[PDB]
Design a protein around this ligand. Structure first.
Ligand SMILES: O=C(O)/C=C/c1ccc(NC(=O)C2(NC(=O)c3ccc4c(C5CCCCC5)c5n(c4c3)CC(=O)Nc3ccccc3-5)CCCC2)cc1
Ligand SMILES: COc1ccc(CNC(=O)[C@H]2CN(c3ccc(Cl)nn3)CCN2S(=O)(=O)c2ccc(OC(F)(F)F)cc2)cc1
Length: 534
């Protein structure tokens, strides 16, 4: 069936992406899906369903569901917002209760969704390729989104780990992700790895995929109202429905994955895992270890020789294409783990204070830096820079640029103690910058504060990126960090800890860094989300 049908009504508005590029995105995401399933697919599905059979899921109350709403979640077309939802205002609660009643009473009627162009910031790259068109966001009304949480919040936050075990990427800190990847690479006699890029994953998700996904959820022990809501949400919302623009006009019809529903992340992970695990069998890949984050997939296996590995990747791709997951860029076998990019990241090596070889996740800093510059220039509720400092804390660029830059601004504005909103792959947090040392030690290890002897390629990538962007060189950042370190230490308390742990790299006469006294429960900085709510 067609992933999308359009009426002609434009995707109207509410470098940076706008509605002016939506037309180009529509062309890319609009195609017919031809899915052919086989025994391997059926076999993996039964195996996944047998694991889901062990899960018991709770049905959340309206209030518990309200308390999980992102503070910045899009407003309801029925006179209430995320603030009203989080405060349990009578208008919000009463409207949500009537939505819930309709989900239990009406099993067929498609639920309306809003189609919108995403405003994302990317960097002005005129060399190998041009600009990117805006992504398309599809979401139901706020009321429906609170109802999804009642029926499925417990499912989506318990089922994936039960079904996929160690293959489920979202259960990991960046430190645990590198450990998993390195351990899996070390455990192969002759390792080979590859990342699989699916072209427009959301668009490739068929009605059958969404029904197979529901067949997995149905395996949980569920409250009857939860069982009916999952059934009603599958037919009325998840499989597809009408698209309405910002001006309230009939835009078209969706028959694929909506990006803004609670099950997007869980569903894409399950669907990606199922197709990939079945494709590994069809390709006859030996001893696979997979890691799945939504549509993002890495496979690590035993090499069967250079030519044989090229042929097995073609068979993997053939199988994925049959399952309705065609490639964007054709996968390539890699025989060095650093060369694989997964979750926009790659493993690199450095050394800690003791001289020990340590592995960490890094990426091209262009996008993180350009996004941080934009945030410095304009008022933004979500601070991608804080997310980036937290997730890439061991990197040369997050340590020397982002940490130095933001701690200097925060010291100057007297805002070190001010809690900031932070979104990481749909999990919302509220973090005071003064608490960053303890968080970094939990997420990455004590070594994140003493990494040095970075790879030359990595050093060159940061240095070339700064030149390209007009950012002062690393020498300027070292000077600037010595200043910030001095003003932080002079303050004592948490500010001194920041100075000590975060900026030890900037000094010639380094301090010996021991485990932090305040280290640890992360879901304490938790406020809303876990890959679902707006
Ligand atoms: O010794 C040498 O050989 C080199 C010396 C040298 C070269 C350039 C400077 N620049 C500056 O002092 C100023 N800018 C900066 O000191 C600056 C700081 C952060 C900057 C960022 C990001 C970095 C990550 C955090 C957010 C800010 C960008 N740009 C920055 C410029 C350059 C810029 O203007 N915009 C962008 C655009 C995209 C990406 C990055 C940038 C301050 C006022 C005058 C301009 C200073 C010294
Ligand atoms: C390229 O490398 C990668 C490494 C890990 C990942 C996967 N991990 C994450 O996306 C984050 C956010 N998480 C999510 C997200 C979606 C869903 Cl469905 N479920 N959980 C919880 C677990 N992690 S986490 O990193 O452990 C963490 C925990 C507490 C924090 O709290 C505080 F902010 F306070 F630090 C902050 C971070 C993805 C990429």
């Amino acid at each position: 069936s067609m992933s999308y049908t359009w009426t002609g009504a434009l995707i109207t508005p509410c470098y940076a992406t706008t509605s002016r590029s939506a037309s180009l995105r529509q062309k890319k995401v609009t195609f017919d899906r031809l899915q052919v399933l086989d025994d391997h697919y059926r076999d993996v599905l039964k195996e996944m369903k047998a694991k889901a059979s062990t899960v018991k899921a709770k049905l959340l109350s309206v209030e518990e569901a309200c308390k999980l709403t992102p503070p910045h979640s899009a407003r309801s077309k029925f006179g209430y917002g995320a603030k009203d939802v989080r405060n349990l205002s009578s208008k919000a609660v009463n409207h949500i209760r009537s939505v819930w009643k309709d989900l239990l009473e009406d099993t067929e009627t498609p639920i309306d969704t809003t189609i919108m162009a995403k405003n994302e910031v990317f960097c002005v790259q005129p060399e190998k390729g041009g600009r990117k068109p805006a992504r398309l966001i599809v979401f139901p009304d706020l009321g429906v989104r609170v109802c999804e949480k009642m029926a499925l919040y417990d499912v989506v936050s318990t089922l994936p780990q039960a079904v996929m075990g160690s293959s489920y990427g979202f259960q990991y800190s960046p430190g645990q992700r590198v450990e998993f990847l390195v351990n899996a690479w070390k455990a192969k006699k002759c390792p080979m790895g590859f990342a699989y890029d699916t072209r427009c994953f959301d668009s490739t998700v068929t009605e059958n995929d969404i029904r197979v996904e529901e067949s997995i959820y149905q395996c949980c022990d569920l409250a009857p109202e939860a069982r009916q809501a999952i059934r009603s949400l599958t037919e009325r919302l998840y499989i597809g429905g009408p698209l309405t623009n910002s001006k309230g006009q009939n835009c078209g019809y969706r028959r694929c994955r909506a990006s803004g529903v609670l099950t997007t992340s869980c569903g894409n992970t399950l669907t990606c895992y199922l197709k990939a695990a079945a494709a590994c069998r069809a390709a006859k890949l030996q001893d696979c270890t997979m890691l799945v984050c939504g549509d993002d997939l890495v496979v690590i296996c035993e090499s069967a020789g250079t030519q044989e590995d090229e042929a097995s990747l073609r068979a993997f791709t053939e199988a994925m294409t049959r399952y309705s997951a065609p490639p964007g860029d054709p996968p390539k076998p890699e025989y060095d783990l650093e060369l694989i990019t997964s979750c926009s990241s790659n493993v690199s090596v450095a050394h800690d204070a003791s001289g020990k070889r340590v592995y960490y996740l890094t990426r091209d800093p262009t996008t993180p830096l350009a996004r941080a510059a934009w945030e410095t220039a304009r008022h933004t509720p979500v601070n991608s820079w804080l997310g980036n400092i937290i997730m890439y804390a061991p990197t040369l660029w997050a340590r020397m640029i982002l940490m130095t830059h933001f701690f200097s601004i925060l010291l100057a504005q007297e805002q070190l103690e001010k809690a900031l909103d932070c979104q990481i792959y749909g999990a919302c947090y509220s973090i005071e910058p003064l608490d960053l040392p303890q968080i970094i030690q939990r997420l990455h290890g004590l070594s994140a504060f003493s990494l040095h002897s970075y790879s030359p390629g990595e050093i060159n990538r940061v240095a070339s990126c700064l030149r390209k962007l007009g950012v002062p060189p690393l020498r300027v950042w070292r000077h600037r960090a010595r200043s910030v370190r001095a003003r932080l230490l002079s303050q004592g308390g948490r500010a001194a800890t920041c100075g000590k742990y975060l900026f030890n790299w900037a000094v010639r006469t380094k301090l010996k860094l021991t485990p932090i006294p305040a280290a640890l429960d992360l879901s304490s900085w938790f406020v809303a989300g876990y890959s679902g709510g707006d």
